[PDB]
PDB file of C-alpha atoms in Angstrom:
ATOM      1  CA  UNK P   1     -52.003  62.110 117.084  1.00  0.00           C
ATOM      2  CA  UNK P   2     -49.903  59.884 119.270  1.00  0.00           C
ATOM      3  CA  UNK P   3     -51.704  57.230 117.011  1.00  0.00           C
ATOM      4  CA  UNK P   4     -53.643  55.788 119.950  1.00  0.00           C
ATOM      5  CA  UNK P   5     -56.224  53.086 119.379  1.00  0.00           C
ATOM      6  CA  UNK P   6     -59.802  54.094 120.198  1.00  0.00           C
ATOM      7  CA  UNK P   7     -59.668  52.043 123.313  1.00  0.00           C
ATOM      8  CA  UNK P   8     -56.520  54.024 124.328  1.00  0.00           C
ATOM      9  CA  UNK P   9     -58.191  57.343 123.373  1.00  0.00           C
ATOM     10  CA  UNK P  10     -61.206  56.490 125.496  1.00  0.00           C
ATOM     11  CA  UNK P  11     -59.013  55.601 128.528  1.00  0.00           C
ATOM     12  CA  UNK P  12     -57.051  58.839 128.043  1.00  0.00           C
ATOM     13  CA  UNK P  13     -60.323  60.884 128.080  1.00  0.00           C
ATOM     14  CA  UNK P  14     -61.872  59.224 131.108  1.00  0.00           C
ATOM     15  CA  UNK P  15     -58.538  59.674 132.990  1.00  0.00           C
ATOM     16  CA  UNK P  16     -58.248  63.329 132.067  1.00  0.00           C
ATOM     17  CA  UNK P  17     -61.848  63.841 133.230  1.00  0.00           C
ATOM     18  CA  UNK P  18     -61.220  62.329 136.649  1.00  0.00           C
ATOM     19  CA  UNK P  19     -58.130  64.602 136.773  1.00  0.00           C
ATOM     20  CA  UNK P  20     -60.379  67.629 136.027  1.00  0.00           C
ATOM     21  CA  UNK P  21     -62.734  66.302 138.771  1.00  0.00           C
ATOM     22  CA  UNK P  22     -59.833  66.145 141.187  1.00  0.00           C
ATOM     23  CA  UNK P  23     -58.473  69.514 140.008  1.00  0.00           C
ATOM     24  CA  UNK P  24     -61.977  70.899 140.769  1.00  0.00           C
ATOM     25  CA  UNK P  25     -62.147  69.348 144.278  1.00  0.00           C
ATOM     26  CA  UNK P  26     -58.570  70.676 144.903  1.00  0.00           C
ATOM     27  CA  UNK P  27     -59.291  74.016 143.043  1.00  0.00           C
TER      28      UNK P  27
ATOM     29  CA  UNK O   1     -55.138  73.492 157.200  1.00  0.00           C
ATOM     30  CA  UNK O   2     -57.135  70.386 158.422  1.00  0.00           C
ATOM     31  CA  UNK O   3     -59.757  71.068 155.754  1.00  0.00           C
ATOM     32  CA  UNK O   4     -56.883  70.982 153.229  1.00  0.00           C
ATOM     33  CA  UNK O   5     -55.530  67.820 154.872  1.00  0.00           C
ATOM     34  CA  UNK O   6     -58.733  65.765 154.403  1.00  0.00           C
ATOM     35  CA  UNK O   7     -59.313  67.119 150.881  1.00  0.00           C
ATOM     36  CA  UNK O   8     -55.835  65.737 149.929  1.00  0.00           C
ATOM     37  CA  UNK O   9     -56.331  62.367 151.644  1.00  0.00           C
ATOM     38  CA  UNK O  10     -59.506  61.812 149.601  1.00  0.00           C
ATOM     39  CA  UNK O  11     -57.840  62.566 146.266  1.00  0.00           C
ATOM     40  CA  UNK O  12     -54.523  60.704 147.084  1.00  0.00           C
ATOM     41  CA  UNK O  13     -55.703  57.187 146.195  1.00  0.00           C
ATOM     42  CA  UNK O  14     -56.878  58.182 142.742  1.00  0.00           C
ATOM     43  CA  UNK O  15     -53.786  60.337 142.061  1.00  0.00           C
ATOM     44  CA  UNK O  16     -51.777  57.318 142.967  1.00  0.00           C
ATOM     45  CA  UNK O  17     -53.511  55.170 140.360  1.00  0.00           C
ATOM     46  CA  UNK O  18     -53.211  57.900 137.699  1.00  0.00           C
ATOM     47  CA  UNK O  19     -49.499  58.387 138.411  1.00  0.00           C
ATOM     48  CA  UNK O  20     -49.111  54.597 137.898  1.00  0.00           C
ATOM     49  CA  UNK O  21     -51.045  54.698 134.521  1.00  0.00           C
ATOM     50  CA  UNK O  22     -49.535  53.434 131.272  1.00  0.00           C
ATOM     51  CA  UNK O  23     -50.545  56.553 129.395  1.00  0.00           C
ATOM     52  CA  UNK O  24     -47.776  59.155 129.766  1.00  0.00           C
ATOM     53  CA  UNK O  25     -50.134  62.114 129.161  1.00  0.00           C
ATOM     54  CA  UNK O  26     -52.157  60.936 132.134  1.00  0.00           C
ATOM     55  CA  UNK O  27     -49.005  60.392 134.269  1.00  0.00           C
ATOM     56  CA  UNK O  28     -47.732  63.916 133.433  1.00  0.00           C
ATOM     57  CA  UNK O  29     -50.923  65.603 134.537  1.00  0.00           C
ATOM     58  CA  UNK O  30     -51.261  63.657 137.614  1.00  0.00           C
ATOM     59  CA  UNK O  31     -47.537  64.534 138.368  1.00  0.00           C
ATOM     60  CA  UNK O  32     -48.180  68.301 137.882  1.00  0.00           C
ATOM     61  CA  UNK O  33     -50.960  68.005 140.329  1.00  0.00           C
ATOM     62  CA  UNK O  34     -49.076  66.048 142.924  1.00  0.00           C
ATOM     63  CA  UNK O  35     -46.298  68.572 142.633  1.00  0.00           C
ATOM     64  CA  UNK O  36     -48.787  71.473 143.194  1.00  0.00           C
ATOM     65  CA  UNK O  37     -50.223  69.577 146.173  1.00  0.00           C
ATOM     66  CA  UNK O  38     -46.763  69.205 147.690  1.00  0.00           C
ATOM     67  CA  UNK O  39     -46.497  73.005 147.990  1.00  0.00           C
ATOM     68  CA  UNK O  40     -48.970  73.334 150.887  1.00  0.00           C
ATOM     69  CA  UNK O  41     -47.945  71.829 154.220  1.00  0.00           C
ATOM     70  CA  UNK O  42     -51.279  70.181 155.043  1.00  0.00           C
ATOM     71  CA  UNK O  43     -51.535  68.239 151.764  1.00  0.00           C
ATOM     72  CA  UNK O  44     -47.733  67.691 151.735  1.00  0.00           C
ATOM     73  CA  UNK O  45     -48.352  65.856 155.056  1.00  0.00           C
ATOM     74  CA  UNK O  46     -51.008  63.660 153.481  1.00  0.00           C
ATOM     75  CA  UNK O  47     -48.669  62.839 150.566  1.00  0.00           C
ATOM     76  CA  UNK O  48     -45.937  61.813 152.984  1.00  0.00           C
ATOM     77  CA  UNK O  49     -48.333  59.665 155.030  1.00  0.00           C
ATOM     78  CA  UNK O  50     -49.124  57.588 151.928  1.00  0.00           C
ATOM     79  CA  UNK O  51     -46.568  54.854 151.084  1.00  0.00           C
ATOM     80  CA  UNK O  52     -48.375  54.125 147.840  1.00  0.00           C
ATOM     81  CA  UNK O  53     -48.297  57.710 146.667  1.00  0.00           C
ATOM     82  CA  UNK O  54     -44.588  58.054 147.632  1.00  0.00           C
ATOM     83  CA  UNK O  55     -43.748  54.816 145.817  1.00  0.00           C
ATOM     84  CA  UNK O  56     -45.627  55.939 142.677  1.00  0.00           C
ATOM     85  CA  UNK O  57     -43.803  59.274 142.678  1.00  0.00           C
ATOM     86  CA  UNK O  58     -40.400  57.507 143.044  1.00  0.00           C
ATOM     87  CA  UNK O  59     -41.181  54.951 140.340  1.00  0.00           C
ATOM     88  CA  UNK O  60     -42.526  57.494 137.905  1.00  0.00           C
ATOM     89  CA  UNK O  61     -39.484  59.774 138.454  1.00  0.00           C
ATOM     90  CA  UNK O  62     -37.232  56.864 137.652  1.00  0.00           C
ATOM     91  CA  UNK O  63     -39.042  55.341 134.647  1.00  0.00           C
ATOM     92  CA  UNK O  64     -40.317  58.417 132.856  1.00  0.00           C
ATOM     93  CA  UNK O  65     -38.938  59.841 129.595  1.00  0.00           C
ATOM     94  CA  UNK O  66     -40.819  62.962 129.905  1.00  0.00           C
ATOM     95  CA  UNK O  67     -38.763  65.876 131.035  1.00  0.00           C
ATOM     96  CA  UNK O  68     -41.598  67.651 132.661  1.00  0.00           C
ATOM     97  CA  UNK O  69     -42.753  64.536 134.516  1.00  0.00           C
ATOM     98  CA  UNK O  70     -39.170  63.949 135.833  1.00  0.00           C
ATOM     99  CA  UNK O  71     -38.997  67.548 136.933  1.00  0.00           C
ATOM    100  CA  UNK O  72     -42.311  67.559 138.788  1.00  0.00           C
ATOM    101  CA  UNK O  73     -41.858  64.261 140.515  1.00  0.00           C
ATOM    102  CA  UNK O  74     -38.163  65.175 141.521  1.00  0.00           C
ATOM    103  CA  UNK O  75     -39.546  68.594 142.756  1.00  0.00           C
ATOM    104  CA  UNK O  76     -42.097  66.718 144.787  1.00  0.00           C
ATOM    105  CA  UNK O  77     -39.550  64.493 146.551  1.00  0.00           C
ATOM    106  CA  UNK O  78     -37.584  67.652 147.128  1.00  0.00           C
ATOM    107  CA  UNK O  79     -40.534  69.185 148.915  1.00  0.00           C
ATOM    108  CA  UNK O  80     -41.114  66.056 151.019  1.00  0.00           C
ATOM    109  CA  UNK O  81     -37.373  65.976 151.934  1.00  0.00           C
ATOM    110  CA  UNK O  82     -37.836  69.117 154.058  1.00  0.00           C
ATOM    111  CA  UNK O  83     -39.592  67.057 156.719  1.00  0.00           C
ATOM    112  CA  UNK O  84     -38.379  64.236 158.846  1.00  0.00           C
ATOM    113  CA  UNK O  85     -41.364  62.072 157.842  1.00  0.00           C
ATOM    114  CA  UNK O  86     -40.868  62.997 154.178  1.00  0.00           C
ATOM    115  CA  UNK O  87     -37.208  61.835 154.352  1.00  0.00           C
ATOM    116  CA  UNK O  88     -38.249  58.566 155.932  1.00  0.00           C
ATOM    117  CA  UNK O  89     -40.984  57.959 153.357  1.00  0.00           C
ATOM    118  CA  UNK O  90     -38.545  58.627 150.429  1.00  0.00           C
ATOM    119  CA  UNK O  91     -36.086  56.318 152.080  1.00  0.00           C
ATOM    120  CA  UNK O  92     -38.485  53.399 152.738  1.00  0.00           C
ATOM    121  CA  UNK O  93     -39.928  53.818 149.271  1.00  0.00           C
ATOM    122  CA  UNK O  94     -36.713  53.123 147.395  1.00  0.00           C
ATOM    123  CA  UNK O  95     -36.248  56.880 146.646  1.00  0.00           C
ATOM    124  CA  UNK O  96     -32.410  56.812 147.013  1.00  0.00           C
ATOM    125  CA  UNK O  97     -31.502  54.718 144.043  1.00  0.00           C
ATOM    126  CA  UNK O  98     -34.085  56.561 141.907  1.00  0.00           C
ATOM    127  CA  UNK O  99     -32.608  59.890 142.944  1.00  0.00           C
ATOM    128  CA  UNK O 100     -29.101  58.723 142.248  1.00  0.00           C
ATOM    129  CA  UNK O 101     -30.206  57.691 138.776  1.00  0.00           C
ATOM    130  CA  UNK O 102     -31.571  61.191 138.147  1.00  0.00           C
ATOM    131  CA  UNK O 103     -27.956  62.446 138.700  1.00  0.00           C
ATOM    132  CA  UNK O 104     -27.446  61.344 135.025  1.00  0.00           C
ATOM    133  CA  UNK O 105     -30.155  63.668 133.728  1.00  0.00           C
ATOM    134  CA  UNK O 106     -29.067  66.329 131.204  1.00  0.00           C
ATOM    135  CA  UNK O 107     -31.767  68.492 132.698  1.00  0.00           C
ATOM    136  CA  UNK O 108     -30.860  71.251 135.173  1.00  0.00           C
ATOM    137  CA  UNK O 109     -34.029  71.458 137.364  1.00  0.00           C
ATOM    138  CA  UNK O 110     -34.011  67.653 137.730  1.00  0.00           C
ATOM    139  CA  UNK O 111     -30.253  67.470 138.683  1.00  0.00           C
ATOM    140  CA  UNK O 112     -31.047  70.254 141.026  1.00  0.00           C
ATOM    141  CA  UNK O 113     -33.891  68.499 142.836  1.00  0.00           C
ATOM    142  CA  UNK O 114     -32.033  65.196 142.843  1.00  0.00           C
ATOM    143  CA  UNK O 115     -28.803  66.514 144.356  1.00  0.00           C
ATOM    144  CA  UNK O 116     -30.561  68.612 147.028  1.00  0.00           C
ATOM    145  CA  UNK O 117     -32.882  65.801 148.044  1.00  0.00           C
ATOM    146  CA  UNK O 118     -29.902  63.439 148.302  1.00  0.00           C
ATOM    147  CA  UNK O 119     -28.102  66.137 150.371  1.00  0.00           C
ATOM    148  CA  UNK O 120     -31.055  66.401 152.750  1.00  0.00           C
ATOM    149  CA  UNK O 121     -31.187  62.544 153.088  1.00  0.00           C
ATOM    150  CA  UNK O 122     -27.380  62.366 153.670  1.00  0.00           C
ATOM    151  CA  UNK O 123     -27.602  65.054 156.327  1.00  0.00           C
ATOM    152  CA  UNK O 124     -30.708  63.913 158.221  1.00  0.00           C
ATOM    153  CA  UNK O 125     -31.723  60.362 157.352  1.00  0.00           C
ATOM    154  CA  UNK O 126     -30.278  57.432 159.123  1.00  0.00           C
ATOM    155  CA  UNK O 127     -29.224  54.717 156.725  1.00  0.00           C
ATOM    156  CA  UNK O 128     -28.931  57.187 153.748  1.00  0.00           C
ATOM    157  CA  UNK O 129     -25.153  57.186 153.428  1.00  0.00           C
ATOM    158  CA  UNK O 130     -24.969  53.405 152.896  1.00  0.00           C
ATOM    159  CA  UNK O 131     -27.945  53.312 150.561  1.00  0.00           C
ATOM    160  CA  UNK O 132     -26.439  56.091 148.429  1.00  0.00           C
ATOM    161  CA  UNK O 133     -23.192  54.090 148.205  1.00  0.00           C
ATOM    162  CA  UNK O 134     -25.090  50.920 147.338  1.00  0.00           C
ATOM    163  CA  UNK O 135     -26.729  52.737 144.441  1.00  0.00           C
ATOM    164  CA  UNK O 136     -23.230  53.734 143.074  1.00  0.00           C
ATOM    165  CA  UNK O 137     -23.861  57.368 144.224  1.00  0.00           C
ATOM    166  CA  UNK O 138     -20.242  58.212 144.997  1.00  0.00           C
ATOM    167  CA  UNK O 139     -19.137  57.606 141.380  1.00  0.00           C
ATOM    168  CA  UNK O 140     -22.187  59.226 139.841  1.00  0.00           C
ATOM    169  CA  UNK O 141     -21.572  62.275 142.137  1.00  0.00           C
ATOM    170  CA  UNK O 142     -17.882  62.345 141.199  1.00  0.00           C
ATOM    171  CA  UNK O 143     -18.878  62.206 137.496  1.00  0.00           C
ATOM    172  CA  UNK O 144     -20.792  65.522 137.864  1.00  0.00           C
ATOM    173  CA  UNK O 145     -17.844  67.496 139.359  1.00  0.00           C
ATOM    174  CA  UNK O 146     -16.531  68.773 136.011  1.00  0.00           C
ATOM    175  CA  UNK O 147     -19.907  69.244 134.439  1.00  0.00           C
ATOM    176  CA  UNK O 148     -21.931  71.588 136.650  1.00  0.00           C
ATOM    177  CA  UNK O 149     -21.920  75.157 137.968  1.00  0.00           C
ATOM    178  CA  UNK O 150     -20.183  76.168 141.129  1.00  0.00           C
ATOM    179  CA  UNK O 151     -23.374  76.045 143.243  1.00  0.00           C
ATOM    180  CA  UNK O 152     -24.097  72.401 142.244  1.00  0.00           C
ATOM    181  CA  UNK O 153     -20.396  71.692 142.606  1.00  0.00           C
ATOM    182  CA  UNK O 154     -20.529  72.995 146.246  1.00  0.00           C
ATOM    183  CA  UNK O 155     -23.519  70.862 147.178  1.00  0.00           C
ATOM    184  CA  UNK O 156     -22.146  67.821 145.471  1.00  0.00           C
ATOM    185  CA  UNK O 157     -18.709  68.373 147.164  1.00  0.00           C
ATOM    186  CA  UNK O 158     -20.591  68.462 150.481  1.00  0.00           C
ATOM    187  CA  UNK O 159     -22.481  65.149 149.688  1.00  0.00           C
ATOM    188  CA  UNK O 160     -19.073  63.691 148.951  1.00  0.00           C
ATOM    189  CA  UNK O 161     -17.555  64.806 152.238  1.00  0.00           C
ATOM    190  CA  UNK O 162     -20.551  63.088 153.935  1.00  0.00           C
ATOM    191  CA  UNK O 163     -19.985  59.834 152.013  1.00  0.00           C
ATOM    192  CA  UNK O 164     -16.269  59.185 151.452  1.00  0.00           C
TER     193      UNK O 164
END
């Protein structure tokens, strides 16, 4: 898509999840 | 408030590291969030109490190529600039030369947040006049005079009267 490597795609997903976790805590 | 304050303080270290990430999708989202946080006074106060967070916002604003990320981090400094402690934090973080650099943006919201933040620093922050000059801010401001609407022109004319 951006043509990320799988290691980059995995980092993107874990970061976005933490962001969702923080978005949740901050509502 | 006070509940909101501690909620922000807990999240701030991780938001900092996400804003400093190499992945620009991650940066963008963390920037939206930091901008949304800067809209409530309690959490705005926890942003301004964190040198690391302020430095990450400044550095992202300055290095990004994403329009939305430049907008949201410029908007955030703008919101901090309404407070004496916000001004000081932008100043100690190297915010002035970043902000002057955003005066070259072709983007209206960004120019807007950059010129108003600089105006608030020039008006209220000791040391700002010299640091704007050092960043080449007089010339960059003068380069905008024939290129913007009459409201930007008025603010920029006022920054210039402060500086010359």
